[model samples]
Target: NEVAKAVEECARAAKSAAPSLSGAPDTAIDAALESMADRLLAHRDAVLAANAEDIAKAEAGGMSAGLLDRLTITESRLTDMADQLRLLAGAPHPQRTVELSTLDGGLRLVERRRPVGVIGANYEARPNVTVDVASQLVKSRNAGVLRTGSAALKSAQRLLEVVIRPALTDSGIDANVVQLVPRPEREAAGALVRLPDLVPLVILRGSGESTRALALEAAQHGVRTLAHADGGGVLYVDEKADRDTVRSLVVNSLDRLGVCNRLNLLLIHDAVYEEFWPVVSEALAERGVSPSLPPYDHPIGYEWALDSEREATVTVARVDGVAEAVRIANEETSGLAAGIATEDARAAEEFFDGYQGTGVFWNAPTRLLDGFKLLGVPETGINLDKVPGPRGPVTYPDLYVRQYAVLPVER
Candidate 1:
């Protein structure tokens, strides 16, 4: 695939030019930002190709069928990734977005999205995230620690070279602004994940295992985290929900190959399952998979354990429909992301009311649970928050930062 070729080339270019970009001026950055949109678009083929290579190699190496599927890349997704960069590049700087004022005399405050310093991003095969994270940091005028999966190591490195680093060097931004882990060993991940001093924020993205391990270690180092546990996310519709609407929500949530935002669990009220499960069963059955009911009368209730080894044939449990939506969410949410979608009051309200999960979903696809997709904010990792919100769970971003206000005045 073009990934190996593209990434390798980009890496060489980036490494060679990095020193020059190390101290470029902001005008350089601005110029690069203007052109990055074009650069990403120009190299669309290679990103997709590199990603495809990982998919093939992963499958051949015994990676799960589902995982292999996640690894697959298409033109639309590639374009979307490019588009995201385009948007990031074009946006007004977060550091310079506003001027704030107070009622008191001559007192004013401003909020800006200045670049965070060097960020260490260790994520899985979702190569596009590499684009998002690096681009976000680049535009903010900060350096990034870019470490993609060993699966796509070459690809990530190359992309930076061809697309980002050149933009930085030519644009006149610090190229160290983005760095990929040099070694491919998983252990290198161990070293980087918790480097609080070296990396201000450690963004961990991947499926469950790598993300979790990376996060736990980062926590030990007291560095903040942005965890990206992938979708497997789920949702629970109260028996009170609109049957047609919610059912559609369920099916649409889990459409066949119904990858992300696709529903996985149907937590129906026993009262509602009669109305819900049949419809859901039909949906999953269409996918050649179906929601399973844990033995109602046995020790197995509607709980999904990571390791459920009770029966010779393992089965996922079904919950009662009247179940508290929160209860179900607590159980199945994977990780939650954000919006550039449904852009209106009704839509925003609906997402707020309907899909507020950082990890879990209620009657919607469990797959939308990813840092890249869920929060919309780039993350280093995703773990259930150690600090529970009034609602019970907080996201990694919430945990990592301290908010403050500064007023300038000499009274």
Candidate 2:
């Protein structure tokens, strides 16, 4: 009951502060983001100290290396986070209003973009996401309530107090508009999704089952959600693929094994299986990642992001051709992202045309699918839903609802 009450208070505060943001000029929003970026660099020492505490506690509890990587925030990561905030500030906001058409009765129809008032986000122990989600919400003129996993709660709180909230206040905005749930209990996540009236839209990110469970709970509560529940990038090596190129792709894709877009499945054509096996094996070994070959007990499509213990491993299988590779990627995997490495342009086109994943690449690593890397702005999460709205990289522009207005034309 206390968790619910705390979460409710946060939602109500964010809702009340929403109007302050909604009416603010674009200059004000940009100023706030710039201030946040400056503050992050100015207070790097304090932020790192807070993160160290979280990491120490997690390591004492025997947290897995994959999760620890996500939790830790180094100097470089802090700088990158600041750089992303500045980039968001410089990026152009979506057009606020558009004239649709003119009607027969001397009336003009128009479409307007409006914020969702208050949004909620539930994610795992990744400390960088606290700033990413909050910055995106502000850039979109939407207030938010953010709930990070208990493991990163301390780091998240420090970030909000020193970096995000203070920056908003310095820019003449109500800091209460961006609230973080103070409780470390998992029940707080449930409370955040239950408040449909206060928080009509929620962004869910984490392992598959828990995020899916939250989505179902949100639906029962009449709240809409953009969920990023599963992820594992697939790389298909065609028969015509270059051996050197394949090796490079394998190395680049596994640069960070804990991230969502890292390569998790490698599908090779049967014709070149013998030729490319050595190259692939050597590449995987260099990254300290093992290949899960045939006769495996687990499902081929199992998302390694969900498996903390075995996150350094990837599934490898031989396919009959590009068709079989595409089939497995579409039907078996999470369909988050897939790439084709081949010298033949037609074959690359064929792979692109056949795969239905959120991100499809030709001779590129799936790690390039991120919001900052691809769009030059921070993201709330990547939505993998097959529905019509915001399929990939859910950013600021995708955080609004549409309002149609019919105005009398001045004749």
Candidate 3:
């Protein structure tokens, strides 16, 4: 009961202080972000120490090194996080940028971008998200209520205390602009999405079933969500695929096996499957990746998205052509990203135009479908929803609501 109350209190405080950023200028927000980066770099030791504590506990509990790596905040990662904030601060502002046009009746129609008020975010044990989500929220001028899993409790708390609060305060914005939920109980996440009025929008990122369940629960309480649930990147090797390029693409994309954009499904056209199998298999062998063939019963897209240790497996299948590959990628798996390894212009064009996923690539790796890699800004999450607002890497610009205003035309 006390934990639930604390979560609500955090939400209420976030709500009460939400409007403080309503009219804040872009310069102030940028300054806040810069301040955050400076503070994190200046006080790197303290942040590292706090991260060490969490890692120690996790190690004792037998956490996998891949996951521990995610929970661990090394000196380089600290610098990277700070640098991400600095870059985001330097990026374009998303609020109050309105498009105006004259309507049929001599009235002006204005579509003004506004913050999404207090956004509630629930994440798992990645400590880096503490900075990413907070930085994006601050950049977009929206107050936030954040909840993290128990494993990252110490790191998140220290980050809020040492980095987030001081940055906001230094920039003349209320420190309550971003609040971390105090309790580490799982119930905090459940309580967070229930108050529709306090938090109308939630950003859900974590395990597939858990995040999807929360999205459903949020809807039950009349709340909206940007849910990044399941993730798997598919690459189709067309008959005309460059053998050398396909090998390079497979090796490069699987370089980092622990991320969402890494190659998970490899579909080769039957026309080239036998010939290309050797090149693909050699690349997988070089990277220590095992090819999980079909016939064993399991979901095609069910390789754990967040787990690093188990990502060494990639599913391989044969397809008839680009059309059949497109159909499978759209229907049989999560629609995150898909690519075609081909020099044929026709096949590339069809693959680009056919797949309805968030990202499509031609003669390239799907791993490039990242916020920093693709857009030059750190991302909170890759929103795979097919809605109109933001479909791909969701940076600060995607965190706003549209307001249509009417005004008399001067002419």
Candidate 4:
């Protein structure tokens, strides 16, 4: 009850403070973001010290290596987070724009971009996300209520203290503009998502089941959510695929195995399986990745999007053609990102048209499906919804509401 009350108070404060943020000058918001990066680096010792404690406790409790990696915030990652904030600061805000259209009746229509007030986010124990979401919200001139799991509470709290609050204050902005729920309990998340009046939109990440449940709960309460649910990347090798290129693609995609874009399912054309299977196996074995061949059926759509050290396994299957590959990817898989490796432009276009996923790749690896990689901007999360506000990488530009105003045209 205390946690819920605290969350409610935080949400109220955020709502009250959000106007100052949305009304503040774009320069002030940018300055705050830049200042945030500098302040984070200035207080690196304390941040790292807090992170070390989290890591130590997590390790002692037998946390998986992949999760432990996400939990630990190293100096390089700190610098990267700072860099991301700086990049966001340098990027232009989509707010404060008026798109005017003229009508025949001497009337002018203006579409104005406005911030989504008091946005909330619920993610796992990734400390970098605390900064990423905060900076993105600030740059977009919206208040934020960030809630992380218990494992990274200390780090997130320290970051909010040493960086977020001070930066906002330094720029003459309301420090309450970015609020962190001090409680490390599940009810805090539920409370945040339920408050439609305070937080109209929430960003949900983490386990598929938990994220889906929270999304449903938020929707029932009339709150919108950007959920990154079940995740897995698929790669389909066509009959016309180049052997050397396919090998390289497999290796490149598996370089980082703990992320949602990591290769989870590999489909080879039955026409090429005899010759290309060895290439895939060799490339995988070279990277210490093991292939999980099909003889068992626990749902071919199963997502191996794991956060454990054992995330080195991939599901391999043989498909008759690109039609089968796209069918399985669209119907069975998570529909995250799928790549078609081939030199046949016709087949590539066919695969692209058939696969209705968030991202489609041709002659490239599926791992390149990231905001930073594709758009040169830091992303808050990836949305896989077919019909929604943002279907791909959700960045700062996507965090706004539109208002249409009609007025008399000037003589």
Best by lDDT: 2
Worst 10 residues of 1 by lDDT: 306-315
The best candidate in terms of TM-score: 4
Best-to-worst lDDT order? 2, 4, 3, 1
TM-score of each: 0.67, 0.91, 0.93, 0.94
Candidate 4: pairs in clash: none
> Across residues 171-221, which tens digit of lDDT does each residue of candidate 1 receive?
655565577765666666666654555565666655456667777787788
- Clash pairs (backbone) in predicted model 3: none
lDDT of each: 0.52, 0.91, 0.85, 0.87
Between candidates 2 and 4, the lDDT winner: 2
Residue-wise C-alpha lDDT for candidate 2, range 303-357, written one tens digit per residue: 8867878989989999999899999999999889999999999999999899998
Question: For candidate 3, what is the lDDT?
Answer: 0.85
Which has the better lDDT: candidate 2, or candidate 3? 2
Stretches > 4 Å off in candidate 4: 52-68, 103-106, 307-310
Which TM-score value belongs to model 2?
A: 0.91
Query: Per-residue lDDT tens digits of candidate 4, residues 307-398?
Result: 36457778899999999999999999878899999999999999999999889998788888888899999877887778858877788888
Position 113, candidate 4: lDDT: 86
